[PDB]
Amino acid sequence: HPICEVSKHLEVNCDKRQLTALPPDLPKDTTILHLSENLLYTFSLATLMPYTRLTQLNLDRCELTKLQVDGTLPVLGTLDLSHNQLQSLPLLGQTLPALTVLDVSFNRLTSLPLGALRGLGELQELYLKGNELKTLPPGLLTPTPKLEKLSLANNQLTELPAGLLNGLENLDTLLLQENSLYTIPKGFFGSHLLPFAFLHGNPWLCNCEILYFRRWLQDNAENVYVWKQGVMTSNVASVQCDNSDKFPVYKYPGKGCPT
Numbered sequence: 001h002p003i004c005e006v007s008k009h010l011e012v013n014c015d016k017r018q019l020t021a022l023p024p025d026l027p028k029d030t031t032i033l034h035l036s037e038n039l040l041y042t043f044s045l046a047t048l049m050p051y052t053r054l055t056q057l058n059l060d061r062c063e064l065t066k067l068q069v070d071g072t073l074p075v076l077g078t079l080d081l082s083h084n085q086l087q088s089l090p091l092l093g094q095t096l097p098a099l100t101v102l103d104v105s106f107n108r109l110t111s112l113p114l115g116a117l118r119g120l121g122e123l124q125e126l127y128l129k130g131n132e133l134k135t136l137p138p139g140l141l142t143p144t145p146k147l148e149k150l151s152l153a154n155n156q157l158t159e160l161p162a163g164l165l166n167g168l169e170n171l172d173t174l175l176l177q178e179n180s181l182y183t184i185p186k187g188f189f190g191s192h193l194l195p196f197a198f199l200h201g202n203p204w205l206c207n208c209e210i211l212y213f214r215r216w217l218q219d220n221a222e223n224v225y226v227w228k229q230g231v232m233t234s235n236v237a238s239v240q241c242d243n244s245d246k247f248p249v250y251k252y253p254g255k256g257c258p259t
Contacts, residue, residue: 001026010053014038022047032056036080039063045095046071060084060103069095082106082127093119093143105151106130117143129153129175136161141168151175153198153227158182165190177201177227182242184213194220198227203242204249208257210241217250 003023004014011032014023019038026033030051040062048054049071056078059067064084069092078101079092086107092099100122109131116137117123123144133155141147145167153175162185165171171192178201197220204210217224221236237248 015058026051029053032058034058035062037061042066042068044068044070045073048073071095074098077101077122079103089113089116091116091118093117096120098122101125103127104131108132110134112137112140115143116140120144121146123147124170125149127151128155131155133157135159136164138163140164142166146170149173152179154178156180160185160188162186162188164188165192168192172196174198175227183209184216186212188212189216189220195223197224199224200226200238200240202239204240206241206243206247206249206252206254208254210249210252211254211257214249214252214254221250 003017004012004026006012006027009031010027010029012026012030013034015034015036017038021040031053033054036058041064043059043064053075054073055075057076058080060080061083064081064086067081067086067090069090072095075098076096077098079096079099080103082103082105084107086104087110089104089109089112097119099120102123105127111133114137117140120143124146126147129151133152135158138161141164147168148170149172157179158181160181165188171194173196174194175198177198181202182205217236217239222234224234224236224239225232226235226238236250239249241247241249241252
């Protein structure tokens with residue numbers, strides 16, 4: 001291609017090219033489109049409809065402040081919108097029915113809309129790390145029962161919906177580290193066998209309302225980890241009471257509390 005380098009499955013590299021918009025006339029059979037590291041500001045998914053075989057779209061580091069969603073990309077499985085400056089998440093369901101991986105990490109989302117994930121029935125991974133979320137809409141994950149990985153790390157969450165994890169029979173990884181959480185709703189984890197949970201870096205308030213969490217931590221000590229930028233060994237003691245001197249939540253007695 002005159003602007004992007006093509007490799008043949010057909011991978012197209014349009015990255016780090018000072019692009020201000022989608023380059024015209026790309027290979028009709030493009031399968032993977034790299035638009036990473038450019039100067040788009042705004043982008044419309046409808047402009048990609050001509051590429052009926054597109055399964056992976058990377059729009060990371062594109063200075064995006066707005067994302068228009070219309071039309072249909074029927075076989076898109078992965079969408080990377082990380083490292084941009086989107087303030088809101090548009091409704092994607094009607095346009096991306098086959099999506100399994102959605103990454104909107106390191107943006108500036110201040111909230112997620114009601115009914116945000118409707119239609120994303122195949123979603124397996126949702127990354128929202130490094131945004132500006134304070135609370136989440138009820139029923140956020142009702143439309144995505146096949147979710148296996150959920151990352152809400154490094155936001156400013158102050159509360160979690162009691163039923164946030166309802167229906168998630170395949171939940172494998174939950175990242176909630178570095179938020180402003182002080183408690184966990186009774187029954188939050190349900191009977192889910194969650195292998196990897198990251199909960200450190202939060203100002204947990206140890207009082208009678210933390211006992212549900214204390215008991216879950218005791219029962220899941222080997223499933224609590226500390227995040228490390230790399231690729232481990234559990235450390236349940238990483239979850240600490242803020243109203244103390246680094247006292248581990250999993251050892252909080254709760255003396256005198258109603259049982």
